[PDB]
Structure 1
Amino acid sequence: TELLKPRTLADLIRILHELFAGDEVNVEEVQAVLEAYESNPAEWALYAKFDQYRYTRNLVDQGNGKFNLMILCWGEGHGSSIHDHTDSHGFLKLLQGNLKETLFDWPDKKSNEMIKKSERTLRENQCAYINDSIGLHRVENVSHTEPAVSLHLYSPPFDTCHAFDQRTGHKNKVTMTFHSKFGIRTP
């Protein structure tokens, strides 16, 4: 439980394997460690594989079963759907640029427009936390000029979740696909 500053991304990953050695999760400690890692672009350039038309998800580490660690690359104007996190912890650390995070309440069964509960601006090196009990969220790169890169950790890992229609609150099941794994493009 002695948390040291991650010197490198590699160091971060090693520390993460220690924090997730057990069955439970100290959320505040994982968040503090993620925040303490100073983004060094050279260290994660291998995973920063962008697509022109939407954001990409690039697997960095499989966390020996307990978590997925991955890097998301957001072109100018790229955003996600409103989604849940499948009963997992979600950690989001900015490695480059800014993201807008918008929070939504779980919809009632009546068809209604989903209204924003709040929004915030995540900035370089900041780490945010989300879970289903906090709410639904959307993540967007609203920048016209700057690509964004984020580091995402999910525990337990999941490759399916729901997307929500902002107009109705209706949900559909969605399968997450990896654009690359361990620096290897995986079509």
Structure 2
Amino acid sequence: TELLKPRTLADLIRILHELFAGDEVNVEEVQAVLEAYESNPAEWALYAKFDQYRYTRNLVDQGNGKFNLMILCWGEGHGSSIHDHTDSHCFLKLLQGNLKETLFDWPDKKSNEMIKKSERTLRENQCAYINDSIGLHRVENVSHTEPAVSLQLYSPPFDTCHAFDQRTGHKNKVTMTFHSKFGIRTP
């Protein structure tokens, strides 16, 4: 329950280990610390590996199996589908550029179009939080000129999240994969 400003991404990763030592998690302490790290591109550029057609997930640290810490690279116009988070804590800090998170309601079992609950446009260094009991979201880099990089930490770690047909609400199970791990590109 001691939180200092993390000098560096590596300092950040150490603090996050201390916070995730136990069984439970204090969601606001994790989020305060992410927001406290000033984005420093020289420290994370290794992991900012872009693909031209969709956003990539670059694993930075496995958190002794209590959380995945990854960085996501969004090419301008890249978006996720609408997804849940497998009953998990999900933190998203912007390291560069801007993303637009659109919050949706869990659809009812009718084949009816999901409609936006709210939206908000995250700017650099802000850290947002979502979990399944808040709703489904969809992050997008709607910029046409600038890429986005975001830092994200999920606990527990999960490989599979669901994708939601926006018109129907029908879900499909999707399996997350990694563009790189620890700076190393994994096909």
Band the TM-score falls in, shorter-chain normalisation = over 0.9
Once residues 161 and 48 of structure 2 are traced to their aligned partners in structure 1, the CA distance between those partners, rounded to angstroms, is 23
SS across alignment from 1:129? strand
Residue ranges of structure 2 left out of the alignment (5+ in a row): none
Alpha-carbon displacement from aligned partner over 1:105-124 (angstroms, at most 9, x marks no partner) = 00000000000000001000
Residue 88 of structure 2 aligns with which residue?
A: 88
Q: CA deviation at 1:3?
A: 0.4
Alpha-carbon displacement from aligned partner over 1:81-133 (angstroms, at most 9, x marks no partner) = 00000000000000000000000000000000000000001000000000000
Cα RMSD (Å) = 0.3
Q: CA deviation at 1:46?
A: 0.3
Once residues 99 and 18 of structure 1 are traced to their aligned partners in structure 2, the CA distance between those partners, rounded to angstroms, is 29
Q: TM-score, normalised by structure 1?
A: 1.00
Once residues 23 and 107 of structure 2 are traced to their aligned partners in structure 1, the CA distance between those partners, rounded to angstroms, is 31
Task: Give the number of aligned pairs.
Answer: 187
Once residues 9 and 105 of structure 2 are traced to their aligned partners in structure 1, the CA distance between those partners, rounded to angstroms, is 34
| Residue 56 of structure 2 corresponds to residue 64 of structure 1 | no
Once residues 2 and 92 of structure 2 are traced to their aligned partners in structure 1, the CA distance between those partners, rounded to angstroms, is 22
Residue 77 of structure 2 aligns with which residue?
A: 77
Alpha-carbon displacement from aligned partner over 1:136-183 (angstroms, at most 9, x marks no partner) = 000000000000000000000001010000000000100001000000
Residue 115 of structure 2 aligns with which residue?
A: 115
Runs of 4+ in 1 over 2 A off after TM superposition: none
Once residues 127 and 159 of structure 2 are traced to their aligned partners in structure 1, the CA distance between those partners, rounded to angstroms, is 22
Q: CA deviation at 1:2?
A: 1.0
Once residues 25 and 107 of structure 2 are traced to their aligned partners in structure 1, the CA distance between those partners, rounded to angstroms, is 28
Residue 105 of structure 1 aligns with which residue?
A: 105
Residue ranges of structure 1 left out of the alignment (5+ in a row): none
Once residues 161 and 74 of structure 2 are traced to their aligned partners in structure 1, the CA distance between those partners, rounded to angstroms, is 20
Q: CA deviation at 1:80?
A: 0.2
SS across alignment from 1:45? helix
SS across alignment from 1:33? helix
SS across alignment from 2:177? coil
Alpha-carbon displacement from aligned partner over 1:14-39 (angstroms, at most 9, x marks no partner) = 00000000000100000000000000
Residue 181 of structure 2 aligns with which residue?
A: 181
Once residues 120 and 170 of structure 1 are traced to their aligned partners in structure 2, the CA distance between those partners, rounded to angstroms, is 25
Alpha-carbon displacement from aligned partner over 1:9-67 (angstroms, at most 9, x marks no partner) = 00000000000000001000000000000000000000000000000000000000000
SS across alignment from 2:13? helix
Once residues 154 and 2 of structure 1 are traced to their aligned partners in structure 2, the CA distance between those partners, rounded to angstroms, is 21
